């Protein structure tokens, strides 16, 4: 008796098609919006996606009342899910992030496989013995595609007479593909490459959602009739309702070991020699090593690097995100952080791996590791509108600008030993960057007389570098190797570059930059966020070739690109804080020790003391 497993929003249920009139048994309850379902029969596992909890979860069918979270981040509308029972992998689609992703069965080693030309991806079906995956897309260009389960050889197999392709399944016995179209009111079948397409049933399908198969019978769920229907897989005859009055039928499978035929795993017993993911592949040797999202596979084709070498770090008002710069997909991963209300400026310390960011609603400077763990408050008093922040990775100090207080201030990196460095002639201070090797800080002011200014790292010898043809200089970035500084101006709508002494000024970008805010340089590239275009973009600093990194993301703010671990440059503050009891503030002419309020330097020029009454 073919058992049918289906998702039902608040629960997952099992019904036997033989006695379909009977009450369906509840497999898992307490769910919110369970949508996609699949299983690993040999492992006794049932998986489901929940689109309100934004999670994929699993349970063991034998035991009871133990729901295991598998994927709980990075999901918005995970509408389709498929288990690779041969290679032991999990695949899913997401129609809001526009991605197809793969992971191990426990959710580890997640990798985004496809991120382009996905609009409303939905159903996904696997042929692990042939290394091919199939999925539907009911979006602007509706289609059925096929690709390697390693992400290779992507091909459109059906692109005509298609509109809402909601359901998709495979017949492993006859090597056939079946799908249901909820607009064109039919179920069709074809070979695995799309050829010899044939109509199975036509007209009795108000709103089919998911389709499955067992022996010579197709089974599908229908959103408008709230039921599971069935017909003969060759002729469409004998159409009938198996099970009715279902609250909200979603994905469905024939729950059987025979629907997951056993074959040799090409990965063997050594995971193919792959350090991380061993994915089924449709070409000899029929596996392919892969790496987590953003991570490069080395030359041997087997061993992953240790994480991304370079990251783009984003503040985005209500969250922070990181994007690897190592791979072409530019997947933004949201950091797991608490109480992010209005994050604005961001920087990063590669020595300890701390991101630092400002927030003018929390009114605090905070830091964390690149995944959101280790999160700590750094500065909480007299924070008002801190629109710029910079890490001094050499002297281990933290700088910020605040247009709510009209100051530039410095602390140690953990927020202690605070000193006001600039407290006059700041109207709208914003971006701030540091050159510890040379002894300078630079900052922008977008007030009524806009400026780019320079001072020593103690705020002394203040000088205006640029005060003409500026308006809203929001972004600032040094090119340490080339002796240049770049800026983005949201009023003149320009990205400009000049030597750090103010010579050689010239316009780099002039078009389609209506409102830069975030702004950073790494290697050959300048990156920015644009408040009006709602995009992250970059330009090659010599060729001026532009690339869109992310489009249509609201609430973009500050941006910093960085090597994750490597730092360059030094000065005498790096050695025992210069001997300074409190702050060591380097200048081109030599370091100056400094003190928080109420302390004074004594005659050794190093030690701060509260002076006697």
């Amino acid at each position, epitope marked *: 008796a073919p058992l049918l497993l289906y998702a039902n929003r*608040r629960d997952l249920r099992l019904v036997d098609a033989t006695n379909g009139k009977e009450n369906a048994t509840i497999v898992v309850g307490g769910l*919110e*919006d369970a*949508a996609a379902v699949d299983f690993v029969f040999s492992h006794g596992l049932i998986y489901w996606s929940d*689109v*309100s909890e934004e999670a994929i979860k699993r349970t063991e069918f034998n035991k009871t009342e133990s729901v295991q979270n598998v994927v709980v981040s990075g999901l918005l*509308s995970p*509408d389709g899910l498929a288990c690779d029972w041969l290679g032991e992998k999990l695949y899913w689609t997401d*129609s809001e992030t526009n991605r197809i992703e793969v992971s191990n069965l426990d959710g580890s080693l997640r990798k985004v496989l496809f991120w382009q030309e996905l609009d*409303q991806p939905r159903a996904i079906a696997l042929d692990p013995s042939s290394g091919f995956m199939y999925w539907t897309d*009911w979006g602007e260009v509706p289609k059925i595609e096929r690709a390697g389960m390693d992400g290779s050889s992507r091909f459109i197999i059906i692109n005509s007479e298609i509109y*809402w392709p*909601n359901g998709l399944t495979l017949d492993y016995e006859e090597q056939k593909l079946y799908w249901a179209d*909820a*607009k064109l*009111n039919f179920i069709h079948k074809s070979n695995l490459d799309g050829t010899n397409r044939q109509a199975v049933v036509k007209g009795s399908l*108000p*709103h089919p959602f998911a389709l499955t198969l067992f022996e010579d019978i197709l089974y599908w769920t229908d959103w*408008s009739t709230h039921s599971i229907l069935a017909c003969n897989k060759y002729t469409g005859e004998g159409l009938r309702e198996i099970h009715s009055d279902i*609250f*909200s039928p*979603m994905d469905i499978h024939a729950f059987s070991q025979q629907r997951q035929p056993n074959a040799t795993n090409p990965c063997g017993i050594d995971n193919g020699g792959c350090s991380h993911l061993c994915l089924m592949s449709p070409v000899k040797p029929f596996y392919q090593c892969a790496c987590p999202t953003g991570v490069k596979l080395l030359e041997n084709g087997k061993t992953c690097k240790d994480g991304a070498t370079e990251l783009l770090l984003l503040a985005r008002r209500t969250d922070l995100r990181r994007i690897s710069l190592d791979t072409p997909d530019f997947t933004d991963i949201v950091l797991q952080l608490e109480d992010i209300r209005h994050a604005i400026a961001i920087d990063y310390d590669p020595v300890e791996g701390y991101i630092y960011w400002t927030d003018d609603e929390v009114r605090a400077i905070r830091r964390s590791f690149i995944d959101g763990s280790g999160s700590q408050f750094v500065v909480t008093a007299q924070i008002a509108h801190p629109d710029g922040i910079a890490v001094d990775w050499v002297a281990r100090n933290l700088y910020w600008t605040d247009t709510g207080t009209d100051r530039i201030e410095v602390t140690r990196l953990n927020g202690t030993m605070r000193k006001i460095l600039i407290s006059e002639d700041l109207e709208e201070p914003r971006a701030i960057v540091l050159d510890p090797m040379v002894g300078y800080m630079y900052w922008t002011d977008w007030g009524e007389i806009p400026k780019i200014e320079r001072a020593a790292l103690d705020g002394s010898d203040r000088v205006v570098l640029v005060n003409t043809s500026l308006g809203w200089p929001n972004g600032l970035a040094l090119d340490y190797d080339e002796g240049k500084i770049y800026w983005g101006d949201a009023k003149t709508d320009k990205i400009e570059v000049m030597n750090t002494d103010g010579t050689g000024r010239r316009v780099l970008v002039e078009d389609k930059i209506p409102h830069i805010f975030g702004f950073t340089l790494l290697g050959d590239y300048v990156y920015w966020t644009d408040w009006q275009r709602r995009s992250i973009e970059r330009v090659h600093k010599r060729s001026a070739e532009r690339e869109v990194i992310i489009d249509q993301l609201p609430d973009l703010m500050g941006l910093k690109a960085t090597n994750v671990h490597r730092v360059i440059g030094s000065n005498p503050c790096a050695e025992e804080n210069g001997g300074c009891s409190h702050l060591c503030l380097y200048r081109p002419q030599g370091l100056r020790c400094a003190c928080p309020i109420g302390f004074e330097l004594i005659s050794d020029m190093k030690t701060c003391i509260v002076p006697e009454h």
Partner: antibody, heavy 127, light 110 residues
Framework: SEVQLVESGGGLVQPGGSLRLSCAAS????????IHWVRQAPGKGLEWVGW????????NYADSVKGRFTISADTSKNTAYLQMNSLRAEDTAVYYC???????????????????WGQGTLVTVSS | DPDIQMTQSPSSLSASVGDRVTITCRAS??????VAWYQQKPGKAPKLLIY???FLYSGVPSRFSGSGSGTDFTLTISSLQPEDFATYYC?????????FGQGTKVEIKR
């Protein structure tokens, strides 16, 4: 480009009589939406009457109107209709049409969230 | 199946300009977060304020907010304005038929 829903057809009708309301839609893809009728008796609250999904013409109705009211749609005119037969005094109300939010085929379905409402048309059933 | 009953409270209230106003809506069945709130000015069609229990609809001022899940839902106006005189309705968007609370009439005290 603005979403608009323009009702017409209301008026006075004797009990037992019939009336057809129209809801002319513009500014969105008609067939990707639920179109609802919702009514409000004088001084009272909101009561859902029924919906149609124009992509295939499927409908649902409130038990209080079942069998007497029929909803239909004409995709070529981007118009929905409420055919009201065997009208009763207690059918007196301002009749609104309203668009369900989101896409009819989406998994995260907001189709019962009524994000744009027409101005309403008054139906009075009286002798 | 029984229609889902939405019970709003209070039926009417009066508050000063600048007051925080909270309206409650209780569902007779668990409806997850599938709750919407509307504002109805006299002689006008309802306008959507909140959907999915807490999501602010585009264009709606930020003084409106919503919260809750399961059966207990609230609408908050954090600083009442003279133009906020209206009847406010909750509605479950969870299943058919959509059903509405009986409304809360908000008056401005002066």
């Amino acid at each position: 480009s603005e979403v608009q829903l323009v009702e017409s057809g209301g008026g006075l009708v004797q009990p037992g009589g019939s009336l057809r309301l129209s809801c002319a839609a513009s500014g969105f893809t008609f067939t990707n939406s639920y179109i609802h009728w919702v009514r409000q008796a004088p001084g009272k609250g909101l009561e859902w009457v029924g919906w149609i999904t124009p992509y295939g013409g499927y409908t649902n109705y409130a038990d209080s109107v079942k069998g007497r009211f029929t909803i239909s749609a004409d995709t070529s005119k981007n118009t929905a209709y409420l055919q009201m037969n065997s009208l009763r005094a207690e059918d007196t109300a301002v009749y609104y049409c309203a668009r369900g939010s989101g896409h009819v085929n989406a998994v995260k379905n907001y189709g019962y969230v009524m994000d744009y409402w027409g101005q309403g048309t008054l139906v009075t059933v009286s002798s | 199946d029984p229609d889902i009953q939405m019970t709003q409270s209070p039926s009417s209230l009066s508050a000063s300009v600048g007051d925080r106003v909270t309206i409650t809506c209780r569902a007779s069945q668990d409806v997850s977060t599938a709750v919407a709130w509307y504002q109805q000015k006299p002689g006008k069609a309802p306008k959507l304020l909140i959907y999915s229990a807490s999501f602010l609809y585009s264009g709606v001022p930020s003084r409106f907010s919503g919260s809750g899940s399961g059966t207990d839902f609230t609408l908050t106006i954090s600083s009442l304005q003279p133009e906020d005189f209206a009847t406010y309705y909750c509605q479950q968007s969870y299943t058919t038929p959509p059903t509405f609370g009986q409304g809360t009439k908000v008056e401005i005290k002066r």
